[PDB]
Design a protein around this nucleic acid. Structure first.
Ligand SMILES: [Mg+2]
Ligand SMILES: [Mg+2]
Ligand SMILES: [Mg+2]
Ligand SMILES: [Mg+2]
Ligand SMILES: [Mg+2]
Ligand SMILES: [Mg+2]
Ligand SMILES: [Mg+2]
Ligand SMILES: [Mg+2]
Ligand SMILES: [Mg+2]
Ligand SMILES: [Mg+2]
Ligand SMILES: [Mg+2]
Ligand SMILES: [Mg+2]
Ligand SMILES: [Mg+2]
Ligand SMILES: [Mg+2]
Ligand SMILES: [Mg+2]
Ligand SMILES: [Mg+2]
Ligand SMILES: [Mg+2]
Ligand SMILES: [Mg+2]
Ligand SMILES: [Mg+2]
Ligand SMILES: [Mg+2]
Ligand SMILES: [Mg+2]
Ligand SMILES: [Mg+2]
Ligand SMILES: [Mg+2]
Ligand SMILES: [Mg+2]
Ligand SMILES: [Mg+2]
Ligand SMILES: [Mg+2]
Ligand SMILES: [Mg+2]
Ligand SMILES: [Mg+2]
Ligand SMILES: [Mg+2]
Ligand SMILES: [Mg+2]
Ligand SMILES: [Mg+2]
Ligand SMILES: [Mg+2]
Ligand SMILES: [Mg+2]
Ligand SMILES: [Mg+2]
Ligand SMILES: [Mg+2]
Ligand SMILES: [Mg+2]
Ligand SMILES: [Mg+2]
Ligand SMILES: [Mg+2]
Ligand SMILES: [Mg+2]
Ligand SMILES: [Mg+2]
Ligand SMILES: [Mg+2]
Ligand SMILES: [Mg+2]
Ligand SMILES: [Mg+2]
Ligand SMILES: [Zn+2]
Lengths: 213, 109, 112, 169, 51, 117
RNA sequence: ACAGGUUUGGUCCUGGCCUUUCUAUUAAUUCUUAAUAAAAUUACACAUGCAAGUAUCCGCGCCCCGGUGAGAAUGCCCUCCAGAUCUUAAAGAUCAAAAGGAGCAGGUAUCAAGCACACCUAUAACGGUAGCUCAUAACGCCUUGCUCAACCACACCCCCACGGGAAACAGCAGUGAUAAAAAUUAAGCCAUGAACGAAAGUUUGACUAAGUUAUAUUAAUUAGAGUUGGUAAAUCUCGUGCCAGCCACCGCGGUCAUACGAUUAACCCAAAUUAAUAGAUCCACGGCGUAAAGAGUGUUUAAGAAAAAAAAUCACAAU
RNA sequence: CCUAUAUUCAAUUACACAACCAUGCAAGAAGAGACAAGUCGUAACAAGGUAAGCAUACUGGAAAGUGUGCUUGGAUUACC
């Protein structure tokens, strides 16, 4: 806070500026960043090792831009799916590519940021978005003829009861609370789950920064 | 004083304790420079065995050796403590008997 | 409806110390503070700069300050609201009559 | 306290026992009184006796005195709204002034008791902690429970030492 | 309610005061008669001496 | 003290003396020390069974749901406690551990009648 | 303070010093066992090991916990909140930087002046007034963590860290040095907390349970220390002879020493007991002819008192 | 610049600077205190053998002496 003799620290500012600058200038190309040593299963850049459960899927499968580099327009309007989704969810889960912006420092051109519109468990989101976990090796491309076989969706309704009992004590508290104010109605108190809907963990999160309203 | 004057000075504050020979520590360790003898002050007389010690604080000071008889040579390390000897003017320290090179007084044999 | 000042001083009343700066009155404010040892009350004084738009202020006037929503400078957090007692020209707030000290300058019982 | 004319008014008790508590509209109270005249008398005793009491209970309110400006004694109250209360105290007694002020902008005894009731629900009986804020520290000290082993050493079985030396063998 | 009450109170006191001051004005004129008499007497005595 | 991030939480502070544990249920910032500063005390839980063979739990329900309503987070053991009380549904992990416990009792039953033979 | 000892041939007064109480460190002497609590010379330098990971790759975490009191009169209390984070649409909520100020806030005035420390204009500039702080302590100098559910600060050094010295335990253990000052190079994530995970769960020198230590309490298995002139509970016989020595203060020792040294008896504390050092406590709401103190004189300033009744003025040696 | 993005830079220059402090050591110098059963005196205390003292001046081995004003913290024993 304010004490009348307080010294003017200059270098505090200098280091902020200089650090931000050396950050922007040395900001790593994601070509080298997610680069992976397949023998040791170790990132050169971060020195990080990959989790045991991801090993096989790393050896045997391909990252997104590995399947998008050999596409003619670099794969616009194409449908893409993820191995994990195919194993867990029997309903269709795909990404439709809106933009693709590869990273060219790469000799083999395997890396880059993507965008699109997502269908998960058959439900479709109405907006464009940046796709998440591109660098992963789970990615697969669906062929043109099979496109209309995957996009084929059998629409089924949801059977989970809209309401459930309150937990035993809480129910008692509510009962007694309404007896006290002279409400005689013995209609069971019910807990309404309409807004308690949550997406399974597989559902990809938006990388886009939030606009504050 | 008046109430204004007492307001203007604040209440009286107890002055911090002024620090003595051991610099506020309970003991000090020091090496013996010289062993000598000092006469007490006038009303009552003997000749009291003292030494000169150098203390871990680097300050050099006269110090007194309790008990009857002692063996102390230069270069002996002793441990000194704060009691002031009333006869001897100027001598504010006392050797601790029974530590390092000052041994406990030997019972007559 | 947000207009505020973070100051504790929202309204104060004080004497005008000096007018020397353009459009700015120096104002000595005084409060009672309880000396803890003697349990007695003494006057602590503190100065405030106040903004005077028309430069209305003689030295010695008792004056009322309102806290400024946005500080004009680092030292000016108040605007001068009213002049409560003009120096040596004082109109009794009780009877509305001119007075010099304890004397009435125009008697309140002589309307006509 | 010896020195002074009415020493009892420098005591914590005397200061406490005065009752006026302004509403929160009140910021500044200004007293204007005279050093002479019979009429002025009451106002003077007010400044001598109650102003200390008042101030003590309204520590945030600027109180300010002025001597021999106007021919007549008065109070002025400055509120937050900008409103200004003017109270003519003339032949009024010390007591009458305090009562009349308490009437205009005081706080009803209802108000004060509600406030202190909100302050006494602040320290809850069933909590645990430092003596400063709570009635009890451990639960070691509630009657039926298990006692602080710093008092009544535990049965060897509840000791972790014994459990560990059991699992080892 | 209370500000109005206070207002009416101040007005009450104001009228009381005006009464008191009229009274004081009267007593004061009486004093002026006395002083005018004495000052006239001594004015005379002085005039005589000097003459 | 000023922190970078972290959320409001309802956890257990551990008071007590060696071998005699005690807990103060507490609403605290997440990043602050276990036994340290807190926002509000909520309840207490005494793990050791008393003279009457009871574990005493105290819950200020009103304030608890005030904070849950501000989006405070619960600790797994506080969850377990509320659930036990019946103010929350049973925590799935309570149920599961119960089942595991049952199967252990079963296999020790069989192993007992197998060793007895 | 419920006070006591000590100024003198003596009495009274004034005035210091000391005793008696309580705690902590260290040391000496003594020491049986448990439990609990606490663990502390060092912002000097550090060998070795460990203290941050989780996770189907991204990510998210990684002085947060934990450490320390170096710096700074820092600051307490209180306004006002940008931002981050959580939740949810929003609204809320938690932590709250910067900016502030009713009040309170270490010593020193032999530190008494600081030397640009203010304001206006308006457009944000040109320009203009000549101010601002301060004996109600400015500006300096010294000392210093704290007002404690906690807070403030630091993170090898150069207030800072781009750079530069240079190669960092003020994480747990350890170790050199240094000091009067001395805990395990230990076991677990089983509980709480924290991180991450959708999750079972993993990690965590936080922490839990242990190890060490009379540091403190308590319980019993444990007896030793100090003292015996007065203050102040308690002494006898030898030895010494102003020597040797003793004492907190008064004082003791010059051949009949209850005061030294040892013995006999006693007193008092007791697993402790003395000593040393730091605290707690302690000065004046008392005084000023003779004891410390009315400042050689008057006037005004600042600041205060006015609290009820009146007054200014005549032989003589002011200047 | 038919989805869209990429990339660059941000260091100097002008001077002053151990004065000024603190902390040690020092050729040396001066004081105070403690100090003989020492040397020289007798200043004070009794009209202390010239009553003491204050300010100031000058002087003297040393206490101190003298001047000028001032003080009683001296007396003049009181029908003398
Ligand atoms: Mg990682
Ligand atoms: Mg003698
Ligand atoms: Mg001694
Ligand atoms: Mg030994
Ligand atoms: Mg504990
Ligand atoms: Mg005497
Ligand atoms: Mg005597
Ligand atoms: Mg005495
Ligand atoms: Mg020890
Ligand atoms: Mg800390
Ligand atoms: Mg400093
Ligand atoms: Mg906000
Ligand atoms: Mg803030
Ligand atoms: Mg320090
Ligand atoms: Mg630093
Ligand atoms: Mg270090
Ligand atoms: Mg640094
Ligand atoms: Mg360590
Ligand atoms: Mg570290
Ligand atoms: Mg060592
Ligand atoms: Mg220790
Ligand atoms: Mg050892
Ligand atoms: Mg754990
Ligand atoms: Mg766990
Ligand atoms: Mg471990
Ligand atoms: Mg002895
Ligand atoms: Mg004898
Ligand atoms: Mg004795
Ligand atoms: Mg003896
Ligand atoms: Mg002990
Ligand atoms: Mg005197
Ligand atoms: Mg005089
Ligand atoms: Mg003088
Ligand atoms: Mg003479
Ligand atoms: Mg004679
Ligand atoms: Mg003589
Ligand atoms: Mg002679
Ligand atoms: Mg003579
Ligand atoms: Mg004489
Ligand atoms: Mg002289
Ligand atoms: Mg001569
Ligand atoms: Mg001559
Ligand atoms: Mg006579
Ligand atoms: Zn306990």
């Amino acid at each position: 806070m304010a004490r009348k003799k307080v010294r003017p620290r200059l270098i505090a500012e200098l280091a902020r500026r200089v650090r931000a600058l050396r950050e922007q200038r040395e900001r790593p190309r994601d070509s080298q960043r997610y680069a992976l040593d397949y023998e040791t299963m170790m990132r050169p850049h971060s020195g990080n090792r990959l989790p045991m459960r991801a090993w096989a899927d790393v050896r045997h499968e391909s990252r997104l831009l590995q399947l998008l580099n050999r596409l003619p327009l670099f794969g616009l309007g194409r449908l893409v799916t993820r191995k994990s989704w195919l194993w867990q969810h029997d309903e269709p889960c795909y990404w439709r590519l809106t933009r693709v912006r590869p990273d060219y420092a790469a000799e083999n051109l395997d890396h880059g940021k993507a965008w699109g519109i997502l269908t998960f468990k058959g439900k479709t989101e109405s907006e464009a978005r940046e796709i998440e976990q591109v660098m992963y090796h789970d990615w697969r491309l669906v062929p043109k003829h099979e496109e209309e076989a995957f996009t084929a969706f059998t629409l089924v309704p949801e059977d989970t009861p809209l309401s459930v009992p309150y937990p035993p004590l809480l129910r008692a508290m509510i009962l007694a609370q309404r007896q006290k104010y002279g409400d005689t109605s013995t209609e069971e108190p019910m807990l309404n789950l309409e807004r308690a809907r949550i997406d399974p963990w597989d559902y990809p999160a938006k990388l886009e920064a939030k606009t504050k309203t | 004083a008046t109430l204004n004057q007492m307001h203007r000075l604040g209440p009286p504050k107890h002055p911090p304790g002024k620090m003595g020979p051991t610099a506020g520590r309970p003991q000090l360790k020091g090496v013996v420079l010289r062993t000598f003898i000092r006469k007490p002050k006038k009303p009552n007389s003997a000749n009291r065995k003292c030494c000169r010690v150098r203390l871990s604080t680097g300050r050099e000071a006269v110090c007194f050796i309790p008990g009857e008889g002692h063996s102390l040579q230069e270069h002996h390390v002793v441990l000194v403590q704060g009691g002031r000897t009333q006869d001897l003017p100027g001598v504010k320290l006392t050797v601790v008997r029974g530590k390092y090179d000052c041994g406990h007084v030997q019972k007559k044999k | 409806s947000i207009a505020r000042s973070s100051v504790h001083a929202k309204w104060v009343v004080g004497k005008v110390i000096g007018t020397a700066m353009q459009k700015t009155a120096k104002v000595r404010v005084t409060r009672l503070v309880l000396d803890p040892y003697l349990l007695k009350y003494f006057n602590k004084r503190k100065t405030y700069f106040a903004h005077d738009a028309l430069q209305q202020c003689t030295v010695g006037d008792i004056v009322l300050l309102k806290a400024l929503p946005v500080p004009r400078t680092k030292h000016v957090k108040h605007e001068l609201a009213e002049i409560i007692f003009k120096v040596g020209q004082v109109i009794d707030p009780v009877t509305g009559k001119p007075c010099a000290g304890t004397t009435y300058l125009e008697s309140p019982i002589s309307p006509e | 306290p010896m020195k002074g004319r009415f020493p009892i008014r420098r005591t914590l008790q005397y200061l406490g026992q005065g009752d006026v508590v302004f509403k929160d509209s009140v910021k500044v109270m200004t007293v204007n009184y005279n050093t002479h005249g019979e009429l002025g008398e009451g106002a003077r005793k007010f400044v001598f006796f109650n102003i200390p009491q008042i101030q003590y209970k309204n520590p945030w309110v600027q109180i300010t005195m002025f001597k021999n400006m106007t021919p007549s004694p008065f109070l002025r109250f400055y509120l937050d709204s900008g409103e200004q209360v003017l109270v003519d105290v003339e032949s009024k007694s010390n007591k009458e002034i305090v009562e009349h002020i308490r009437k205009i902008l005081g706080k009803n005894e209802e108000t004060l008791e509600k406030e202190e009731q909100e302050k006494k629900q602040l320290s809850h009986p069933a909590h645990f902690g430092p003596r400063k804020y709570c009635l009890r520290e451990c639960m070691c000290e509630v009657e039926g429970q298990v006692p602080c082993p710093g008092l009544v050493p535990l049965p060897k079985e509840m000791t972790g030492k014994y459990k560990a030396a059991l699992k080892a063998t | 309610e209370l500000m109005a009450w206070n207002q009416a109170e101040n007005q009450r006191l104001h009228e009381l005061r005006l009464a008191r001051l009229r009274q004081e004005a009267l007593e004061q004129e009486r004093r002026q008669a006395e002083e005018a008499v004495l000052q006239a007497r001594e004015a005379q005595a002085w005039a005589q001496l000097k003459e | 003290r000023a922190y970078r991030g972290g959320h409001l939480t309802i956890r257990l502070a551990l008071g007590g003396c060696t071998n005699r544990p005690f807990y103060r249920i507490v609403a605290a910032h997440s990043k602050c020390p276990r036994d340290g500063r807190f926002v509000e005390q909520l309840g207490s839980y005494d793990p050791l069974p008393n003279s009457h063979g009871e574990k005493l739990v105290a819950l200020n329900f009103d304030r608890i749901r005030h904070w849950i309503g501000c989006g405070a987070h619960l600790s797994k053991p506080v969850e377990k406690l509320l659930g036990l009380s019946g103010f929350y549904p049973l925590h799935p992990m309570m149920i599961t551990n119960a089942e595991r416990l049952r199967r252990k009792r079963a296999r020790e039953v069989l192993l007992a009648s197998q060793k007895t033979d």
